[PDB]
Scaffold this active site. Structure first.
Site, mmCIF file in Angstrom:
data_model
loop_
_atom_site.group_PDB
_atom_site.id
_atom_site.type_symbol
_atom_site.label_atom_id
_atom_site.label_comp_id
_atom_site.label_asym_id
_atom_site.label_seq_id
_atom_site.Cartn_x
_atom_site.Cartn_y
_atom_site.Cartn_z
ATOM 1 N N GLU A 1 -109.350 3.581 11.975
ATOM 2 C CA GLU A 1 -110.250 3.243 10.877
ATOM 3 C C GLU A 1 -111.070 2.016 11.269
ATOM 4 O O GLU A 1 -110.521 1.050 11.803
ATOM 5 C CB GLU A 1 -109.468 2.954 9.593
ATOM 6 C CG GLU A 1 -110.359 2.857 8.351
ATOM 7 C CD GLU A 1 -109.588 2.588 7.062
ATOM 8 O OE1 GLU A 1 -108.359 2.375 7.125
ATOM 9 O OE2 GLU A 1 -110.218 2.595 5.981
ATOM 10 N N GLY B 1 -104.152 -5.989 9.857
ATOM 11 C CA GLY B 1 -103.010 -6.139 8.970
ATOM 12 C C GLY B 1 -102.033 -4.981 8.950
ATOM 13 O O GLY B 1 -100.888 -5.121 9.389
ATOM 14 N N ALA B 2 -102.453 -3.847 8.401
ATOM 15 C CA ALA B 2 -101.634 -2.644 8.433
ATOM 16 C C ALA B 2 -102.534 -1.443 8.178
ATOM 17 O O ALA B 2 -103.662 -1.583 7.699
ATOM 18 C CB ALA B 2 -100.498 -2.709 7.406
ATOM 19 N N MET B 3 -102.014 -0.256 8.501
ATOM 20 C CA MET B 3 -102.797 0.971 8.432
ATOM 21 C C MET B 3 -101.932 2.122 7.938
ATOM 22 O O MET B 3 -100.777 2.264 8.347
ATOM 23 C CB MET B 3 -103.384 1.320 9.805
ATOM 24 C CG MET B 3 -104.259 2.557 9.796
ATOM 25 S SD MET B 3 -105.682 2.349 8.718
ATOM 26 C CE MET B 3 -106.047 4.059 8.334
ATOM 27 N N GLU B 4 -102.521 2.968 7.093
ATOM 28 C CA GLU B 4 -101.798 4.002 6.351
ATOM 29 C C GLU B 4 -101.819 5.370 7.033
ATOM 30 O O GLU B 4 -101.916 6.393 6.350
ATOM 31 C CB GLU B 4 -102.357 4.112 4.933
ATOM 32 C CG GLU B 4 -103.785 4.681 4.839
ATOM 33 C CD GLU B 4 -104.862 3.608 4.791
ATOM 34 O OE1 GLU B 4 -104.589 2.454 5.182
ATOM 35 O OE2 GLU B 4 -105.990 3.923 4.356
ATOM 36 N N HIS C 1 -98.610 -1.351 -0.529
ATOM 37 C CA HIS C 1 -100.010 -0.962 -0.387
ATOM 38 C C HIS C 1 -100.147 0.259 0.515
ATOM 39 O O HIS C 1 -100.784 1.250 0.146
ATOM 40 C CB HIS C 1 -100.808 -2.142 0.176
ATOM 41 C CG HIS C 1 -102.275 -1.879 0.327
ATOM 42 N ND1 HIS C 1 -103.194 -2.183 -0.656
ATOM 43 C CD2 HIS C 1 -102.985 -1.355 1.355
ATOM 44 C CE1 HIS C 1 -104.404 -1.852 -0.243
ATOM 45 N NE2 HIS C 1 -104.306 -1.347 0.973
ATOM 46 N N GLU C 2 -99.532 0.210 1.698
ATOM 47 C CA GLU C 2 -99.671 1.311 2.642
ATOM 48 C C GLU C 2 -99.018 2.579 2.112
ATOM 49 O O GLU C 2 -99.553 3.678 2.298
ATOM 50 C CB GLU C 2 -99.084 0.925 3.996
ATOM 51 C CG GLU C 2 -99.730 -0.313 4.612
ATOM 52 C CD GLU C 2 -101.239 -0.197 4.743
ATOM 53 O OE1 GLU C 2 -101.750 0.943 4.814
ATOM 54 O OE2 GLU C 2 -101.916 -1.247 4.767
ATOM 55 N N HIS D 1 -101.187 4.340 -0.467
ATOM 56 C CA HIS D 1 -102.326 5.049 0.107
ATOM 57 C C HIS D 1 -102.028 6.524 0.346
ATOM 58 O O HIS D 1 -102.965 7.317 0.500
ATOM 59 C CB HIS D 1 -102.722 4.425 1.448
ATOM 60 C CG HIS D 1 -103.844 3.437 1.363
ATOM 61 N ND1 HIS D 1 -105.024 3.701 0.702
ATOM 62 C CD2 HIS D 1 -103.977 2.194 1.887
ATOM 63 C CE1 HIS D 1 -105.829 2.657 0.808
ATOM 64 N NE2 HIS D 1 -105.218 1.731 1.525
ATOM 65 N N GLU E 1 -109.561 1.705 -1.707
ATOM 66 C CA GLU E 1 -109.057 0.345 -1.537
ATOM 67 C C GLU E 1 -108.942 -0.393 -2.867
ATOM 68 O O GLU E 1 -107.934 -1.059 -3.121
ATOM 69 C CB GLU E 1 -109.923 -0.431 -0.545
ATOM 70 C CG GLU E 1 -109.919 0.153 0.863
ATOM 71 C CD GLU E 1 -108.523 0.296 1.438
ATOM 72 O OE1 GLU E 1 -107.585 -0.331 0.898
ATOM 73 O OE2 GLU E 1 -108.358 1.043 2.426
HETATM 74 N N1 LIG Z 1 -107.033 0.941 5.077
HETATM 75 C C1 LIG Z 1 -106.504 -0.300 5.663
HETATM 76 C C2 LIG Z 1 -107.666 -1.127 6.214
HETATM 77 C C3 LIG Z 1 -107.173 -2.359 6.958
HETATM 78 C C4 LIG Z 1 -107.113 -3.595 6.032
HETATM 79 C C5 LIG Z 1 -108.033 -4.649 6.108
HETATM 80 BR BR1 LIG Z 1 -109.466 -4.630 7.406
HETATM 81 C C6 LIG Z 1 -107.913 -5.728 5.243
HETATM 82 C C7 LIG Z 1 -106.883 -5.760 4.309
HETATM 83 C C8 LIG Z 1 -105.966 -4.717 4.225
HETATM 84 C C9 LIG Z 1 -104.860 -4.834 3.185
HETATM 85 C C10 LIG Z 1 -105.162 -5.099 1.856
HETATM 86 C C11 LIG Z 1 -104.142 -5.218 0.924
HETATM 87 C C12 LIG Z 1 -102.820 -5.087 1.320
HETATM 88 C C13 LIG Z 1 -102.518 -4.839 2.649
HETATM 89 C C14 LIG Z 1 -103.538 -4.721 3.583
HETATM 90 C C15 LIG Z 1 -106.089 -3.618 5.098
HETATM 91 C C16 LIG Z 1 -105.116 -2.398 5.109
HETATM 92 C C17 LIG Z 1 -105.679 -1.058 4.609
HETATM 93 O O1 LIG Z 1 -106.459 -1.237 3.455
HETATM 94 O O2 LIG Z 1 -104.588 -0.252 4.273
HETATM 95 ZN ZN LIG Z 2 -105.835 -0.289 1.870
#
Ligand SMILES: [NH3+][C@H]1CCc2c(Br)ccc(-c3ccccc3)c2CC1(O)O
Ligand SMILES: [Zn+2]
Ligand code: NA
Length: 868
Positions: free
Chosen positions: A119, A259-262, A295-296, A299, A318
């Protein structure tokens, strides 16, 4: 030539769809060979070519139905194939080099492991493909690698095949039955320890949970596993959603930008949001791991089962997922503290972005580099917009809209408008005017004046709204603002809202430029609580008296309102003393202001979680938003002087509350966390008492702490107050933790945010520190980012030394890791908020970067808007 911008109004359905793709990876760090067999279907005109996205790929062969193809051509970032039938099989073979991928997008190296990040548009760095989120295909992935170096080979879905080869290589094949856009593809190869557990859904599906971590870290994973299970149970109870697969894998990696990815069934996490031990992690870390894990997981429905038609719809997933992780943390923990900190972020960081050259609506209309739009606006303001829908509909209607959203769009790629329509149709609440929140940028300003008529016993609110123009929009119109109020009488009792003999809802619909609201049977002149629970993301203008605010600090029903009233009280005197500092005058503060905080310290009926936040002064970035022109040096010194004044006037009360909240046992439990936050809030003030007393208390807490929360609070106070023990404590911390990067990040943040006069000299020297490296995004943001973003007094030194330091760092990162560079340049874009002499130096710095060789599009977009 830098990239042309893309516009939301140009969306067009794709000429070609791909329904299934079979991938084979022959893995190697220096060279990986990718083979991709895709089943394609033409939906457009018979003479329209297939245009595939691709970046830094070495093409090896292109076959159509097994026929070597001749009607193709490579262009900048694309492979164009012509003269195709309506249905066919496309086979592409290409090569990539993960070891040379320092930008960390696509397939890259994280230490000894190989992992992916796709992403927004990273899959095109792996192979030529339709890298757009409205193309959804069923994936099958076969991985081939050296067995000794890569014993674990992971991808989305379930294992369906596996074998061994000669020369010490083996392979595994994965199959994911849910169609997905390519940005949710993931691959991991390496050697790990694995913590394994299970979770049984309410309907009886047993889900295997697997958390992959570096060898030796199994004792740091239990909390993450617990948070995953907590996330799965909460989504069932609150939203009625169950997981849809057989396994749930999480992989912790040390090198990660986002940070993290789903990724479906195979999340990849920055190690900062997985690993935790009481001696190395703080209460904030534990609660951050909880929110990110949640959060993940959330998603999986708001993002994966329903995805985005295009990237301009990013907030569709988001904003809604942030809202979900906020409700998750609030239900399980302290709702008041979660809301207060979410509001600090909106007022303190998002409002400024909406007041900058990068301002945009939550649903952008124009984008050059999509990675620049994972922003506070799309995430944090996006969630406030979702919360406003929840406020207008109520929990019951809101869940009905969720279920209709999933009924209509499960298994497709939808838009923001689709979501609003689902909420509108399910609840029968008109949201046509509310849609403007998605298309208009900037922060609305709500002005309020009241009038009490004793003869008629009527209370009248006259409310006006306006949104200042922003650099991206010259046209602004009124919004549908939910404006929640509460009226209190002389005894602190709520006055029922009514008009003409009928009850009136406490959520007012402020929909016009100006409007009046009349209330009857107001027996006594009330004290209003306005914009309760931050019911809309707006600036409030109301001429409070100090006595109204202290009254609300004593009597308001909702804990958020008591904190909010304290912020309004402080704001008046933060602005007073910043003006005094600029004229060389010392701090002036009325006696009754200090007494209000004395009463908070000594109120035995107040939740310590709330008391701790009222006793936490606004950050320098929150304070900056109070001013038309930012004086960062006056703000910083006024914050310290205010801390010293309250520490002297409340010395005895602070020490008593500090000692009363001592806890011998350390527990990661919300009640224990609250007492500890109140204790360490008192410690911040006590650090500014008499030197001999402060130096003994701080050093004692550091050496006796049985957890990192209490140890870091003491170390932070020593740096903040420049106590004599500082240097010794900072050396011991280094000597003990220098081999743990996550623990050292907190150490670098303290160095970069130090009030010492030689902070920049120290920061530059730390570029050679044994624990720092420009190759790791976490280290970069802990030292360089914390300096430029969280130490504005030093970043904005009058000699301009801070700007030149950042230019050097960005000159490196523009070539190494553009995504991380784009986050570090944000302090420079805000030049128009500062004085003319500072603007001149900041423009000169932007001009230097503008003329760099191979300027990345990430920085080009921001530099161009900043210099306009
Ligand atoms: N789809 C991904 C995109 C990568 C991303 C960014 Br770039 C900035 C903040 C966060 C995030 C926001 C809140 C909690 C945990 C993580 C994320 C993680 C995501 O949104 O899951
Ligand atoms: Zn997210
Ligand atoms: Na709660």
């Amino acid at each position: 030539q830098q990239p042309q911008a893309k516009y939301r109004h140009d969306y067009r359905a794709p000429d070609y769809q791909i329904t299934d793709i079979d991938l084979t990876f022959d893995l190697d760090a220096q060279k990986t060979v990718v083979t991709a067999v895709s089943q394609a279907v033409r939906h457009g005109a018979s003479d329209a070519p297939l245009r595939l996205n691709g970046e830094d790929l070495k093409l090896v062969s292109v076959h159509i139905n097994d026929e070597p193809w001749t009607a193709w051509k490579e262009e900048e970032g694309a492979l164009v194939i012509s003269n195709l039938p309506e249905r066919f099989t496309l086979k592409i073979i290409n090569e990539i080099s993960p070891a040379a991928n320092t930008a960390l997008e696509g397939l890259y190296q994280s230490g000894d492991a190989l992992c992916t990040q796709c992403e927004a548009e990273g899959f095109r760095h792996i192979t030529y493909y339709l890298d757009r989120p409205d193309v959804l295909a069923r994936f099958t992935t076969k991985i081939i690698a050296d067995k000794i170096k890569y014993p674990f080979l992971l991808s989305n879905g379930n294992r369906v095949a596996q074998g061994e080869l000669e020369n010490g290589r083996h392979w595994v094949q994965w199959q994911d039955p849910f169609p997905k856009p390519c940005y949710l593809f993931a691959l991991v190869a390496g050697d790990f320890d694995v913590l394994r557990d299970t979770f049984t859904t309410r309907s009886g599906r047993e889900v295997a949970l697997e958390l992959y971590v570096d060898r030796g870290n199994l004792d740091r994973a239990p909390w993450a596993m617990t948070s995953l299970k907590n996330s799965m149970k909460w989504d069932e109870e609150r939203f009625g959603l169950e997981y849809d697969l057989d396994i749930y894998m999480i992989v912790a990696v040390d090198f990660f930008n986002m940070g993290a990815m789903e990724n479906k069934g195979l999340n990849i996490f920055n190690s900062k949001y997985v690993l935790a031990r009481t001696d190395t992690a703080t209460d904030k870390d534990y609660l951050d791991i909880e929110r990110v894990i949640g959060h993940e997981y959330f998603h999986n429905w708001t993002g994966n089962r329903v995805t985005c038609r295009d990237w301009f719809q990013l907030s569709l997933k988001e904003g809604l997922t942030v809202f979900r992780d906020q409700e998750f943390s609030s239900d399980l923990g302290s709702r008041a503290v979660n809301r207060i900190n979410n509001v600090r972020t909106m007022r303190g960081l998002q409002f400024a972005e909406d007041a900058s050259p990068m301002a945009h609506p939550i649903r952008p209309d124009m984008v050059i580099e999509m990675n620049n739009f994972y922003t506070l606006t799309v995430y944090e303001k996006g969630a406030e917009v979702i919360r406003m829908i929840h406020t207008l509909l109520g929990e019951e209607n809101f869940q009905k809209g969720m279920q209709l959203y999933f009924e209509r769009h499960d298994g497709s790629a939808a838009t923001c408008d689709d979501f609003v329509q689902a909420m509108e149709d399910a609840s029968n609440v008109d949201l046509s005017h509310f849609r403007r929140w998605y298309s208009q940028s900037g922060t609305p300003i709500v002005t309020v004046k009241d009038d009490y008529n004793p003869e008629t016993e009527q209370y009248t609110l006259t409310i006006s709204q306006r949104t200042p123009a922003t650099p991206d929009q010259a046209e602004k119109q009124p919004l549908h603002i939910p404006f929640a109020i509460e009226l209190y009488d002389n005894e602190g009792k709520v006055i029922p809202l009514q008009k003409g003999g009928h009850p009136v809802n406490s959520v007012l619909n402020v929909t016009q430029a100006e409007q009046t609201f009349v209330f009857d049977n107001v027996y006594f002149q009330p004290v209003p609580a306005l914009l309760c629970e931050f019911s809309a993301p707006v600036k409030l203008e109301y001429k409070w008296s100090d006595q109204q605010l202290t009254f609300l600090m004593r009597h308001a029903r909702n804990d958020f309102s008591r904190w909010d009233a304290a912020q309004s009280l402080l704001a008046t005197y933060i602005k007073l003393n910043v003006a005094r500092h600029q004229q060389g005058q010392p701090l002036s503060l009325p006696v009754h202001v200090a007494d209000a905080f004395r009463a908070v310290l000594l109120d035995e009926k107040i939740d310590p979680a709330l008391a701790a936040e009222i006793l936490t002064l606004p950050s320098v970035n929150e304070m900056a938003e109070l001013f038309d022109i930012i004086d960062p040096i006056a703000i910083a010194e006024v914050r310290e002087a205010l801390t010293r004044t309250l520490a002297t006037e409340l010395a005895d009360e602070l020490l008593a509350i500090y000692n009363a909240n001592y806890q011998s046992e350390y527990r990661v439990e919300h009640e224990d966390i609250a007492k500890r936050t109140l204790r360490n809030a008192c410690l911040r003030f006590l650090a500014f008492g008499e030197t001999h007393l402060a130096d003994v208390l701080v050093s004692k807490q550091f050496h006796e702490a049985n957890n990192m929360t209490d140890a870091l609070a003491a170390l932070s106070a020593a740096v903040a107050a420049q106590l004599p023990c500082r240097d010794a404590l900072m050396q011991e911390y280094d000597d003990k933790w220098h081999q743990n990067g996550l623990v050292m990040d907190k150490w670098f943040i303290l160095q970069a945010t130090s009030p010492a006069a030689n902070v920049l000299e120290t920061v530059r020297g730390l570029l050679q520190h044994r624990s720092f490296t420009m190759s790791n995004p976490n280290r970069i943001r802990s030292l360089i980012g914390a300096f430029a973003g969280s130490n504005p007094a030093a970043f904005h030194a009058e000699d301009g030394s801070g700007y030149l330091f950042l230019v050097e760092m960005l000159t490196d990162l523009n070539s190494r890791n553009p995504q991380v560079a784009s986050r570090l340049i944000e302090p420079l874009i805000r030049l128009k908020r500062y004085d003319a002499k500072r603007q001149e130096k900041m423009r000169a710095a932007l001009e230097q970067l503008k003329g760099l060789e191979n300027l990345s599009g990430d920085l080009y977009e921001k530099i161009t808007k900043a210099l306009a």
